Design an enzyme around this catalytic site. Structure first.
Site, mmCIF file in Angstrom:
data_model
loop_
_atom_site.group_PDB
_atom_site.id
_atom_site.type_symbol
_atom_site.label_atom_id
_atom_site.label_comp_id
_atom_site.label_asym_id
_atom_site.label_seq_id
_atom_site.Cartn_x
_atom_site.Cartn_y
_atom_site.Cartn_z
ATOM 1 N N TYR B 27 0.850 -1.218 0.000
ATOM 2 C CA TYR B 27 0.000 0.000 0.000
ATOM 3 C C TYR B 27 0.876 1.255 0.000
ATOM 4 C CZ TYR B 27 0.792 0.799 5.013
ATOM 5 O OH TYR B 27 1.351 1.052 6.232
ATOM 6 N N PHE B 37 1.730 9.850 3.354
ATOM 7 C CA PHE B 37 1.952 9.749 4.821
ATOM 8 C C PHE B 37 2.558 8.389 5.186
ATOM 9 C CE2 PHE B 37 -2.657 8.827 4.191
ATOM 10 C CZ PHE B 37 -2.721 7.537 4.665
ATOM 11 N N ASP B 38 2.488 7.395 4.295
ATOM 12 C CA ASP B 38 2.985 6.023 4.584
ATOM 13 C C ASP B 38 3.026 5.198 3.296
ATOM 14 O OD1 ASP B 38 4.004 3.955 6.140
ATOM 15 O OD2 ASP B 38 2.066 3.430 7.056
ATOM 16 N N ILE B 57 -8.898 0.229 9.339
ATOM 17 C CA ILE B 57 -10.027 1.193 9.153
ATOM 18 C C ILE B 57 -11.101 0.564 8.255
ATOM 19 C CG2 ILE B 57 -8.704 3.276 9.667
ATOM 20 C CD1 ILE B 57 -8.442 3.741 6.631
ATOM 21 N N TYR B 83 -10.401 8.002 9.786
ATOM 22 C CA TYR B 83 -10.070 8.469 11.157
ATOM 23 C C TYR B 83 -11.027 9.592 11.581
ATOM 24 C CZ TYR B 83 -6.055 5.506 10.178
ATOM 25 O OH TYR B 83 -5.261 4.446 9.854
ATOM 26 N N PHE B 100 -5.619 5.409 -0.836
ATOM 27 C CA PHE B 100 -4.660 4.281 -0.724
ATOM 28 C C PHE B 100 -4.519 3.624 -2.097
ATOM 29 C CE2 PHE B 100 -3.587 3.768 3.758
ATOM 30 C CZ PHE B 100 -4.581 4.454 4.416
HETATM 31 C C1 LIG Z 1 3.909 2.314 13.082
HETATM 32 O O1 LIG Z 1 2.941 2.412 12.044
HETATM 33 C C2 LIG Z 1 1.658 1.899 12.415
HETATM 34 C C3 LIG Z 1 0.712 2.076 11.226
HETATM 35 C C4 LIG Z 1 0.474 3.494 10.734
HETATM 36 C C5 LIG Z 1 -0.274 4.372 11.718
HETATM 37 C C6 LIG Z 1 -0.684 5.683 11.060
HETATM 38 C C7 LIG Z 1 -1.496 5.442 9.790
HETATM 39 C C8 LIG Z 1 -1.873 6.759 9.114
HETATM 40 C C9 LIG Z 1 -0.724 4.509 8.844
HETATM 41 O O2 LIG Z 1 0.419 5.157 8.387
HETATM 42 O O3 LIG Z 1 -0.294 3.319 9.526
HETATM 43 C C10 LIG Z 1 -1.540 3.973 7.671
HETATM 44 O O4 LIG Z 1 -0.976 3.777 6.605
HETATM 45 C C11 LIG Z 1 -2.820 3.569 7.788
HETATM 46 O O5 LIG Z 1 -3.701 4.427 7.896
HETATM 47 N N1 LIG Z 1 -3.117 2.241 7.857
HETATM 48 C C12 LIG Z 1 -2.103 1.177 7.924
HETATM 49 C C13 LIG Z 1 -2.315 0.141 6.827
HETATM 50 C C14 LIG Z 1 -3.721 -0.429 6.895
HETATM 51 C C15 LIG Z 1 -4.756 0.713 6.814
HETATM 52 C C16 LIG Z 1 -4.523 1.781 7.882
HETATM 53 C C17 LIG Z 1 -4.998 1.262 9.238
HETATM 54 O O6 LIG Z 1 -6.103 0.837 9.447
HETATM 55 O O7 LIG Z 1 -4.046 1.345 10.172
HETATM 56 C C18 LIG Z 1 -4.352 0.966 11.555
HETATM 57 C C19 LIG Z 1 -4.920 2.208 12.257
HETATM 58 C C20 LIG Z 1 -3.903 3.340 12.288
HETATM 59 C C21 LIG Z 1 -5.422 1.919 13.674
HETATM 60 C C22 LIG Z 1 -6.528 0.880 13.827
HETATM 61 C C23 LIG Z 1 -7.704 1.140 12.889
HETATM 62 C C24 LIG Z 1 -8.850 0.152 13.112
HETATM 63 C C25 LIG Z 1 -9.318 0.200 14.555
HETATM 64 O O8 LIG Z 1 -10.389 -0.725 14.745
HETATM 65 C C26 LIG Z 1 -8.170 -0.130 15.493
HETATM 66 O O9 LIG Z 1 -8.653 -0.028 16.831
HETATM 67 C C27 LIG Z 1 -7.819 -0.626 17.816
HETATM 68 C C28 LIG Z 1 -7.006 0.819 15.279
HETATM 69 C C29 LIG Z 1 -3.086 0.393 12.163
HETATM 70 C C30 LIG Z 1 -2.862 -1.062 11.843
HETATM 71 O O10 LIG Z 1 -3.181 -1.523 10.767
HETATM 72 C C31 LIG Z 1 -2.228 -1.945 12.912
HETATM 73 C C32 LIG Z 1 -1.387 -3.074 12.318
HETATM 74 C C33 LIG Z 1 -3.317 -2.511 13.789
HETATM 75 C C34 LIG Z 1 -3.690 -2.094 15.001
HETATM 76 C C35 LIG Z 1 -2.965 -1.048 15.801
HETATM 77 C C36 LIG Z 1 -4.921 -2.659 15.688
HETATM 78 O O11 LIG Z 1 -5.627 -3.510 14.811
HETATM 79 C C37 LIG Z 1 -4.607 -3.424 16.976
HETATM 80 O O12 LIG Z 1 -5.820 -3.584 17.693
HETATM 81 C C38 LIG Z 1 -5.629 -3.869 19.075
HETATM 82 C C39 LIG Z 1 -3.939 -4.763 16.672
HETATM 83 O O13 LIG Z 1 -4.593 -5.776 16.594
HETATM 84 C C40 LIG Z 1 -2.427 -4.763 16.496
HETATM 85 C C41 LIG Z 1 -2.028 -5.682 15.346
HETATM 86 C C42 LIG Z 1 -1.730 -5.145 17.807
HETATM 87 C C43 LIG Z 1 -0.217 -4.900 17.818
HETATM 88 C C44 LIG Z 1 0.383 -5.125 19.208
HETATM 89 C C45 LIG Z 1 0.080 -3.507 17.339
HETATM 90 C C46 LIG Z 1 0.544 -3.149 16.152
HETATM 91 C C47 LIG Z 1 0.693 -1.792 15.697
HETATM 92 C C48 LIG Z 1 1.152 -1.343 14.470
HETATM 93 C C49 LIG Z 1 1.284 0.012 13.990
HETATM 94 C C50 LIG Z 1 1.750 0.442 12.821
HETATM 95 C C51 LIG Z 1 2.407 -0.448 11.795
#
Ligand SMILES: CO[C@H]1C[C@@H]2CC[C@@H](C)[C@@](O)(O2)C(=O)C(=O)N2CCCC[C@H]2C(=O)O[C@H]([C@H](C)C[C@@H]2CC[C@@H](O)[C@H](OC)C2)CC(=O)[C@H](C)/C=C(\C)[C@@H](O)[C@@H](OC)C(=O)[C@H](C)C[C@H](C)/C=C/C=C/C=C/1C
Ligand SMILES: [Cl-]
Ligand SMILES: [Cl-]
Ligand SMILES: [Cl-]
Ligand SMILES: [Cl-]
Ligand SMILES: [Zn+2]
Ligand SMILES: [Zn+2]
Ligand SMILES: [Zn+2]
Ligand SMILES: [Zn+2]
Ligand SMILES: [Zn+2]
Ligand SMILES: [Zn+2]
Ligand SMILES: [Zn+2]
Ligand SMILES: [Zn+2]
EC number: 5.2.1.8
Lengths: 93, 108
Positions: B27, B37-38, B57, B83, B100
């Site tokens: 992506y 942004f990513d 999301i 968001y 995206f």
């Molecule tokens: C460092 O970079 C970040 C990602 C960044 C943050 C800022 C955004 C601009 C962005 O750049 O990604 C971005 O490109 C983006 O918007 N994304 C990422 C690619 C998929 C689409 C979107 C998204 O939904 O991101 C997501 C968005 C930002 C937040 C979530 C959106 C859906 C909502 O229901 C969730 O509520 C909780 C929060 C980030 C993710 O895809 C990551 C993987 C998943 C989560 C954090 C949650 O699902 C969490 O719930 C407990 C989990 O089950 C995780 C796996 C548990 C473990 C320990 C944590 C992992 C964390 C990883 C974080 C990472 C790589």
């Protein structure tokens, strides 16, 4: 309780607090005790085994958190979560 | 509506993600103006996630579910499927439409 399960649950909850609820203080509340637990050092063979496997990755994630606390630059916090995500996937059975 | 899917290059139009299946994608995330942004391509590591778990999301959940393996698609995601009013301080502005560039590489 196994270090990998405490880190699994803590990283998952911390990510929910930050990414879900835009709560950086709450995130730091969950991570600090786990980093402190690491700092006290491993007791069991499994704790020693875990520290050897992912000690370096968890230390660099904390360093980025400390850099963020000074900078206030979210880029530093996202670097930390890149390492936490990496560790989360490695440790998770 | 919340997410618009526009094909850049086609998949097989048959292999759509099921429940309990891991989507493997590259992506690039941009604001509506087109500011990046990513990107997973910046890390040369595909992004892996499971549909129906609320891991990503709503726009991804509904957008990627419509894509077939091999398909590269542009997802235009309205704030309410992204968001929302809050956004993400220092990353995503409030009320932001996100674009995206998503490639569904395979399913696992
Ligand atoms: C460092 O970079 C970040 C990602 C960044 C943050 C800022 C955004 C601009 C962005 O750049 O990604 C971005 O490109 C983006 O918007 N994304 C990422 C690619 C998929 C689409 C979107 C998204 O939904 O991101 C997501 C968005 C930002 C937040 C979530 C959106 C859906 C909502 O229901 C969730 O509520 C909780 C929060 C980030 C993710 O895809 C990551 C993987 C998943 C989560 C954090 C949650 O699902 C969490 O719930 C407990 C989990 O089950 C995780 C796996 C548990 C473990 C320990 C944590 C992992 C964390 C990883 C974080 C990472 C790589
Ligand atoms: Cl779980
Ligand atoms: Cl686990
Ligand atoms: Cl892969
Ligand atoms: Cl499969
Ligand atoms: Zn273990
Ligand atoms: Zn869990
Ligand atoms: Zn590593
Ligand atoms: Zn370092
Ligand atoms: Zn990794
Ligand atoms: Zn997952
Ligand atoms: Zn498989
Ligand atoms: Zn794979």
């Amino acid at each position: 309780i196994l270090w990998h399960e405490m880190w699994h649950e803590g990283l998952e909850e911390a990510s929910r607090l930050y990414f879900g609820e835009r709560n950086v203080k709450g995130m730091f509340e969950v991570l600090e005790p786990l980093h402190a637990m690491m700092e006290r050092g491993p007791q069991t063979l499994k704790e020693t085994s875990f520290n050897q496997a992912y000690g370096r990755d968890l230390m660099e994630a904390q360093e980025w958190c400390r850099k963020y606390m000074k900078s206030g630059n979210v880029k530093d916090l996202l670097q930390a979560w890149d390492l936490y995500y990496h560790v989360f996937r490695r440790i998770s059975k | 509506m919340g997410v618009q899917v526009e094909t850049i290059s086609p998949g097989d139009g048959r292999t759509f993600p099921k429940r309990g299946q891991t989507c493997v994608v590259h992506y690039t995330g941009m604001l509506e103006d087109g500011k990046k942004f990513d990107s997973s391509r910046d890390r040369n590591k595909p992004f892996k996630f499971m549909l129906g778990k609320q891991e990503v999301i709503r726009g991804w959940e509904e957008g990627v579910a419509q894509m077939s393996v091999g398909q590269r698609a542009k997802l235009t995601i309205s704030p309410d499927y992204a968001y929302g009013a809050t956004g993400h301080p220092g990353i995503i502005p409030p009320h932001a439409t996100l674009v995206f560039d998503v490639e569904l590489l395979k399913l696992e």
